Design a protein around this ligand. Structure first.
Ligand SMILES: Nc1ncnc2c1ncn2[C@@H]1O[C@H](COP(=O)(O)O)[C@@H](O)[C@H]1O
Ligand SMILES: Nc1ncnc2c1ncn2[C@@H]1O[C@H](COP(=O)(O)O)[C@@H](O)[C@H]1O
Ligand SMILES: Nc1ncnc2c1ncn2[C@@H]1O[C@H](COP(=O)(O)O)[C@@H](O)[C@H]1O
Ligand SMILES: Nc1ncnc2c1ncn2[C@@H]1O[C@H](COP(=O)(O)O)[C@@H](O)[C@H]1O
Ligand SMILES: Nc1ncnc2c1ncn2[C@@H]1O[C@H](COP(=O)(O)O)[C@@H](O)[C@H]1O
Ligand SMILES: Nc1ncnc2c1ncn2[C@@H]1O[C@H](COP(=O)(O)O)[C@@H](O)[C@H]1O
Ligand SMILES: Nc1ncnc2c1ncn2[C@@H]1O[C@H](COP(=O)(O)O)[C@@H](O)[C@H]1O
Ligand code: SF4
Ligand code: SF4
Ligand code: SF4
Lengths: 465, 465, 465, 465
């Protein structure tokens, strides 16, 4: 998922639409904007793409000088309109409250159970809602402090944008697992999960949001505060490996560049003698470019991705698929035929895509296919976001690198060492891990996981199918 | 536009749908499929993306073992449902005829005049409709010979696919201006505008359709006949430079490879000392890869394209635009800032896009923007297809290269030479031009152009706006 | 089907949309409007309801001071876009021609076979296309003389509106089988299939178009000419019995009042003793009111029709249907229980509805159900329009009135006599038939019916299902 | 709004689609269905007509043997997805609950105000949500007993349907202001606001739900407990006068017959010499027939309503409107010209429709237009339902019958008397009001209205516009 907010722009919902649109790769399962004019909160949301939701007719109904928005992921595409964020709570003779979140709370099961016994009913299956109930039951005398202390009760990954009629409150968890960055646009402040949305919108980037920090932004300006001084910096490593758009800079490290270095690191860890380097369209293009350059083997387009495959694309029958019919990716014979191909891919999670890709690449006539992954094996469950998790198996859970080389049928398979990865991304944070979360790879989480903690996706509500 | 056909496959409308979707880049303004079962022709078509047109519920209406499909381009996005192809003409006690075209008949106004005078009424503004009036009024004695001699009355560019209940006729013009290839998929014969459609569907390439050749495909098999032994091979150079999918091989020369060599010719004709090579997303990635390798300047992703802009995407206002809001493309500050960039693009037609890209590139921090273009200047009009024409002004009609350079705002501008273009593509054909059409660049059209000849867009029917 | 036209009103497409909207009852399978400003005809059409076709965004494109529109009936709901009208032909350096028909040409096959022999290809199975081809192939010097002379070659029913950039030509066949009337709305002349359209649009009625008359309406005024002086007036009796909207007046006789008089005839021809009178929702309300008024038995609402059934209404399964789920109509038990019902309907065609209704009336507790039908039996086919014919078996062909009574399960069954039908409508014309077509009742057609005359629906194009 | 539920049928969501369809006239702003198989609740809901909401694909996703459904009214067509019911609240490790309401809680502001002071956040502005919070916070031990005591706190009109995975609880307020009737369909119990739903679906009437009664339906069967003894019968008089479909029986009295009697009362209290009785298409058809019969003046269709006006219908401009273009209703000249017309309407609420109708009738040539109303003046507000209130000015709050006669332009104007009304409907309930709510007419409410009580509409959520 991804979040965007702007306080102090008279066209703030139109800007949130473009901002949210740069973050459209972070989830296509729902989108929504809530805006305040200082008097009242107006909103629109729905399932699907920002263009699908705001066909238009709808961007006209959201007016305000400040707005927050959210782009949402859902594993099983559907989940319900219920969970499309921002969530909005109204209280007459007390105010409106809107909230958006990118992350996953590890103790939300537990908290919902306690809340229901204090007499709470839940309508969504969102972690945002759990926060709404906690602010409301807080005994502190100020919204800033009720939020400030409700965050004390939450465990896990979270980027929250909260907005009422009169101020935007931004908070980043003490590990800083999810990205949140502040930029400026005139005299408006803007907060976004990735800096590429500032590029798109015309906003000058100011700085990241510290782990454990909470910003109150309103007509007086931006106020900072720190709800936790006990911090442990460990950003999601996959943000740099696969999830962020290439033109974002996570902590000042540009994602294209970092990814290119993982191709470079991979080359120096594992060269092969071969004739062509191909990446995989869109996920490993940058790393393939870096690997090819470090190695001197020419960089080629040996896989092409169809640009118009969507939810409306009819998938081929198993029969057509065994007859030869491709769906989103096909190997290109005019480049790979009679060549020894190295296929750089950013990661193997289930094993499925690399297998299909080694086969396509063999049918096109590659005589050797070597697979190079700019990641360590992903062995463990991510408990920090629907987007960063999978409900399907991790073959590294059960297989070795020779058993995975064997399942996908590579002539050879390589992963980056944890050491090469950290070396490659290049953070300057003194500790073992340079301030990054490596738990999917290594098993060691920067967070206490509970016995009750469910895998993020498990929190679903609408069936869809 | 692009056509696709298959005779003898028990799943022919489905195969035609996957075939047309790999040709979707060839036109997004309408799509259609006409299929036959030996008995009656059933058909579905409409305006829009293939997936918009067969949402589904609809491919299940169109059934048969033979099928032809067309993907259409219209400059004024609209044109009218009437112009969406295939065109189906019906006659009880004499048969159905379905026709799809890719090319532009340069003598169609003249032929329509002579036809309305012999009593003809025209429902569309399609050339396809001109061809069907000529078949009906032909006094030759067999369908094959009527098409064969109506083809002789046509001037310009054409790849025609014709289908009745019982056969499929394919014809390629005497210059071979627009492409066509034949493949086989088990026992079925398939025809496509580019070979990438064979790759996707799982069909074996056999050969191209010869300039001046016509194939009669049916249940007996495939028959060839030459309707003109007076041929002058001149294929569209822009097919190679820009229009084809990268994985397609035109006349056995792979399109990615060719473009990459065009980058290597540009590097030796005009190599500059700079820090970064960047292509423009999607249109000049391969030429920029080749330029970069040729030159030893590292290839970066200095520009990004938003994957979700579209006909529903709300375009930003003029105000928002001068506030700095981006639409489909942005430069990536993390790669170009403080750097000297070479921006390699395949072609400059109107000069709008590179003026925008050099600006954005300066705004993001490039100390130098050097623009290298893998084409000669396009100074003359194309009369051989809507898809290969523009209705806006070619500035190299008016501007010298330094006048274009000043206008787009580049530090330098360099185009490929015609000697370097023919050298880069590598066609082995004994003549000045290696079998290509260089008219937009040189002024020498390979067909006669009349004083009555309209430029492709001029033929429109619906307003749309 | 229904046609509407207005010349000389600057808001003419909008007026045509409301005018056609009041004739929507004549056709639910397509709607289209063509308008002219003096230079160009602009048009929009599609399948479905007017409201469906013109969501809006669309009615903004059809701009002009003259417009013609058509509402279409297609039996097997579909036909295909191609048969949706008005048909628009364009011809550079010679003019566009839009045409809309309501009727059926009994010798269309013969004429089409001839035109194909002179080199014509047809794209639609529209009679309008036949007329378009006859006009062009006429030798005459002026559109008026070419039309005048083409109409001579037409046999069957026809109300035609033709339109060009500069004039409208209206023409009605020598029998006046189908109604047309003229109105004036300020200075604009309006033309419509029924007068309710004029009530709805604020136009004043003028007069009926004469059988054999063609009118040329343009900015000079309207001119009447006679293209056939050999007329034998035979209006569709079913226009009066069932098809027209109750507030329309055919030859100055009001449709509700005529139908109510047919209700008073049936009471003097067949008065029975019962308790409650009920018509059927919507088709036989006025007649039911007449039979009750005549009789002194109270008129009740003993059947209800659901206002929200339509194409998007899911039909009950066979299972659910015999469990007792009703679809459009249900008997109101609270009116009919233990009561002797006379149920008045306008006509029995297939036998189905009357069987369904008498079953429900008995299920709701009725003690006797006496069907009274205000029509003679319909025993012969209609060759004068899809809207007035059926593809299904008519039971009065095979069954005597007692066998039809046994089939529908009524206690008694009475049909209006032809003499009562003629006395009931009250047309003042001197001849046997009071100027009415009664072919479907008596077997005798007001027109020559060929061995090549197909039933109108047998002229279909698209499968749809 | 209307509610329908069925317990114990394998095809229960389908039965509810049809049930909800017969009640579609009670509200057109949303539709929802929640089914239970014994293990889990599945739902689907959305704004628009049932046929719009369940296009299908959707109805098949709901599965179970028990289901509840609601059809919603929203004054301003809008309110937002949140207010569309049945509301569903989930709790893992405590069960799901679904609720549908038809009524208005006159004390809900007070109740929300209390709930919020106990830690409750609210997401929708529905009263169903208020009850939800109140059941969860109830100290009692069994769900039955929780509901029993929450209902005791509610002030106003309410017909609740509650459903969990295993039982359906039905409850009607102590005045029975809104109808609920129980029927039986095999062994499945079925509950609906109007009995037409039973007809339409094949359910056999059983008995009405008593006021202050609650029923617990589950696989054991049906249980009944009186949550209140202190009851004061006052059914809505407007259910009889206008709101119910004409085949429903409210309290064993048929709505068309009761309406026809109100027509006969108005006749004996205000008779006139005129030549035509006309009703207004659909609301006053039954009363108009009663008046004509009692008066001996002929009943005619003097006004037609257009069957195809909709949300999607493009409203005429002011200029088109004053040019004479009609919207949903037109007057018929063939019936009323040169005639004295009595127009019987069911009620006058803002005075707009009847001014509009009397003008049209005069423009059609009527000499006299005498308006008779089968209601008293509606001079007071309704605080018991959005469907039975208007947010607009009631003109009998400010105007006398003669000021109203002048405003609407009537030749003469009459309203029924409260006595004539109680007498026409025919309840023999001993008490002054025959067991009816007459507040809108007399100012006497059957309930305590609070100083905090707002008019139903004022509780609006989404802006829409
Ligand atoms: N506009 C874009 N340009 C290039 N890569 C993109 C873009 N948006 C997202 N990405 C990358 O696309 C990859 C995911 O796409 P895919 O794996 O092809 O579905 C991610 O690794 C992203 O970093
Ligand atoms: N958590 C994730 N969710 C979705 N896509 C992922 C995830 N992690 C990585 N990806 C993409 O999935 C690929 C591996 O696919 P598979 O092996 O089929 O699971 C990687 O190359 C990524 O492009
Ligand atoms: N699926 C695809 N993968 C990669 N490039 C493509 C694809 N389809 C078309 N192209 C190229 O994209 C360019 C057009 O994209 P653009 O000019 O960015 O809109 C052309 O130069 C095509 O050769
Ligand atoms: N005939 C053409 N029609 C459409 N796009 C074109 C054409 N020729 C080249 N292109 C694209 O136009 C670009 C030049 O854009 P401009 O200079 O704004 O006309 C190239 O990079 C191609 O992507
Ligand atoms: N707006 C309308 N009001 C009343 N009756 C109508 C209307 N439009 C069409 N009709 C009549 O309704 C009958 C067809 O409707 P139905 O029988 O309900 O399908 C015909 O007899 C028409 O004359
Ligand atoms: N030609 C026709 N086609 C369609 N509806 C018709 C036609 N003639 C009469 N109707 C209607 O069909 C009824 C007879 O229906 P059925 O006997 O089931 O065919 C009458 O009440 C009319 O509403
Ligand atoms: N509560 C109400 N809300 C909506 N329509 C109503 C209401 N009460 C009566 N009606 C209709 O409104 C008509 C009166 O219209 P008007 O006087 O313009 O409000 C009556 O014939 C009813 O059909
Ligand atoms: S003139 Fe240019 S774009 Fe046109 S056919 Fe020739 S090479 Fe192609
Ligand atoms: S045969 Fe019947 S339906 Fe046909 S035109 Fe004559 S009266 Fe009308
Ligand atoms: S005030 Fe009137 S409309 Fe409201 S509940 Fe009472 S009778 Fe009904």
């Amino acid at each position: 998922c991804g979040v965007f907010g702007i306080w102090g722009h008279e066209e703030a919902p139109q800007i949130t639409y473009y901002g949210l649109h740069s973050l459209q790769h972070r989830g296509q399962e729902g989108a929504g904007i809530v805006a305040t004019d200082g008097e009242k909160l107006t909103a629109h949301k729905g399932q699907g793409l920002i263009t699908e939701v705001f066909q238009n007719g709808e961007l006209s109904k959201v007016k305000g000088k400040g707005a927050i928005g959210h782009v949402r992921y859902a594993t099983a595409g559907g989940g319900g309109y219920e969970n499309v964020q921002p969530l909005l709570f109204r209280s007459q003779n007390n105010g409106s409250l809107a909230l958006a979140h990118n992350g996953n709370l590890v103790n939300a099961t537990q908290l919902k159970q306690q809340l229901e016994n204090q007499g709470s009913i839940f309508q969504t299956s969102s972690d945002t809602e759990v926060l709404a109930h906690l602010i409301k039951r807080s005994g502190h005398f100020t919204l800033k402090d009720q939020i400030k202390n409700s965050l004390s009760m939450l465990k896990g990954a979270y980027a929250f944008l909260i907005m009422t009629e009169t101020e935007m409150i931004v908070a980043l968890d003490p590990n800083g697992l999810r990205p949140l960055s502040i930029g400026m646009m005139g005299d408006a402040y803007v907060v976004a999960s990735e800096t590429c949305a500032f590029d798109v919108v015309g906003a000058t980037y100011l700085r990241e949001v510290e782990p454990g920090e909470m910003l109150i932004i309103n007509d007086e300006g931006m106020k900072s505060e720190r709800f936790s001084m006990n911090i442990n910096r460990s950003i999601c490593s996959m943000e740099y490996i696969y999830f962020s758009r290439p033109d974002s800079n996570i902590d000042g490290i540009n994602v294209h560049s970092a990814r290119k270095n993982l191709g470079k690191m991979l080359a120096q860890e594992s060269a092969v003698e071969a004739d062509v380097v191909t990446g995989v369209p869109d996920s490993s293009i940058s790393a393939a470019i870096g690997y090819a350059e470090a190695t001197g083997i020419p960089y080629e387009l040996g896989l092409i991705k169809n640009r118009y495959v969507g939810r409306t694309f009819i998938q081929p029958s198993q029969a057509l698929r065994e007859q030869g019919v491709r769906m989103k990716l096909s190997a290109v014979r005019g480049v790979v035929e009679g060549k020894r191909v190295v296929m750089v891919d950013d990661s193997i999670v289930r094993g499925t895509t690399s297998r299909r890709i080694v086969t396509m690449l063999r049918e096109a006539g590659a005589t050797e296919v070597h697979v190079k992954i700019s990641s360590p094996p992903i062995a463990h469950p991510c408990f920090y976001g629907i987007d960063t998790s999978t409900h399907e198996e991790l073959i590294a859970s059960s297989h070795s690198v020779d058993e995975i080389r064997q399942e996908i049928g590579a002539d050879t398979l390589s992963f980056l060492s944890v050491e090469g990865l950290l070396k490659g991304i290049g953070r300057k944070y003194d500790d073992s891990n340079c301030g990054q979360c490596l738990a999917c790879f290594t098993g060691k989480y920067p967070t206490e996981i509970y016995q009750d903690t469910v895998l993020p996706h498990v929190k679903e509500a609408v069936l869809t199918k």
